[PDB]
């Protein structure tokens, strides 16, 4: 018999003295060693002292997994481990001063997600994401990418949408202080006011222009427009179907270009430092001008009132 450690939250290590006659599955249920499914393998002698990931089998483990991941999906833990076995073989090079992801398994949309996050003043509620994000910013992003796939209920190799991915992640970001309030104008609504809090206070679908939200957008049974009267957030994400759109330095924080069609496309990240950057995985292109099909644009924000 050997002494190992089981854990669900990478934080609390539960000492376990394991019988060498039963498999790991017999003793804790499905078990993992650095991503490897060790459920149906007898414990080797050199496995002593190592730590293994297990699913919550009791209520203390269920408490630790909930406080660490802020989820109750038990398939979450399973899917997280399954994704990790792939993402720890991805490459995370520094591109444009930021951590990118080398092309693999249709990861382009995930790369655009990771690049924009590194430039937004945002931090997560769930300790799992916040701790994995701190390592992602340092180039060790395998755990963070696997968590994103797990939180989004996506698998390695699946084509993705950047906006949908951000909406799932920002559910665990501290947007408690984010508030957006709009004045809707119809000819018989009086002065009607719409207030958004949370993920919907910093996200919008319809146009890539933050100025158009301040200028006035239309809303879908009769004619009605809507303009922003107050914004309180560290950033705003403007989204729209892929439209040809020019990006000017100093007028935006970052953006995603989407080439291709509705069925199959290619995401590409765009930023600006001394000049405009085009970050496509491990690839980088510098440019004085950009004009192309953009789906999401990020803007720096602090306080805005009309």
Q: In Å, how far are 73, 153, 247, 248 from 83, measured between CA atoms?
A: 16, 11, 34, 37
Boundaries of every domain in the chain: 1-54, 55-178, 179-306
Q: Any residues with CB less than 8 A from the CB of 243 and at least 6 apart, and which?
A: 208, 293, 294
Checking 286-290 for CB contacts under 8 A at 24+ apart, the result is 289/246, 290/246, 290/247
> Is residue 264 marked as binding?
no
Look at the chain and count its residues: 306
270, 256 contact by CB (below 8 A): yes
Active site residues: 108, 266, 280
Reported structure resolution in angstroms: 2.3
Distance CA 53, CA 225 (A): 52
Tokens found for residue 111: 């790369």
166, 114 contact by CB (below 8 A): no
139, 145 contact by CB (below 8 A): no
The residue written with tokens 């994103």 in the block is 148
Q: Work out the burial of residue 138: count CB atoms within 10 Å of its CB; fewer than 13 is exposed, 13-18 middle, 19 or more buried.
A: exposed
Distance CA 266, CA 209 (A): 22
């Amino acid at each position: 018999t050997i002494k190992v450690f089981t854990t669900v939250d990478n934080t609390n290590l539960h000492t376990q003295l394991v019988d060498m006659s039963m498999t790991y599955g017999q003793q804790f249920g499905p078990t993992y060693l650095d991503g490897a499914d060790v459920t149906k393998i007898k414990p080797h002698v050199n496995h002593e002292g190592k730590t293994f990931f297990v699913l919550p089998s009791d209520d203390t483990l269920r408490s630790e997994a909930f406080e660490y991941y802020h989820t109750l999906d038990e398939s979450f833990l399973g899917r997280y481990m399954s994704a990790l076995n792939h993402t720890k073989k991805w490459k995370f090079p520094q591109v444009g001063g930021l951590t990118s992801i080398k092309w693999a398994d249709n990861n382009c949309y995930l790369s655009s997600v990771l690049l924009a996050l590194q430039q937004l003043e945002v931090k997560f509620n769930a300790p799992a994401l916040q701790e994995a994000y701190y390592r992602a910013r340092a180039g060790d992003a395998a755990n963070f990418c696997a968590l994103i796939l797990a939180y989004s209920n996506k698998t390695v190799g699946e084509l993705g949408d950047v906006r949908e991915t951000m909406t799932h992640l920002l559910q665990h970001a501290n947007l408690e202080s984010a508030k957006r309030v709009l004045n809707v104008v119809c000819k018989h609504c009086g002065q009607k006011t719409t207030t958004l809090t949370g993920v919907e206070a910093v996200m919008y679908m319809g146009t890539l222009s933050y100025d158009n939200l301040k200028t006035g957008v239309s809303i879908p049974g009769r004619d009605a427009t809507q303009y922003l009267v107050q914004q309180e957030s560290s950033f705003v994400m403007m989204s729209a179907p892929p439209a040809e759109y020019k990006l000017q330095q100093g007028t935006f924080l970052c953006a995603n270009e989407y080439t291709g069609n509705y069925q199959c496309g290619h995401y590409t990240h765009i930023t600006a430092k001394e000049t405009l950057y085009r970050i496509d995985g491990a690839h980088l292109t510098k440019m004085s001008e950009y004009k192309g099909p953009v789906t999401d644009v990020f803007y720096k924000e602090t306080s805005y009132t009309t």
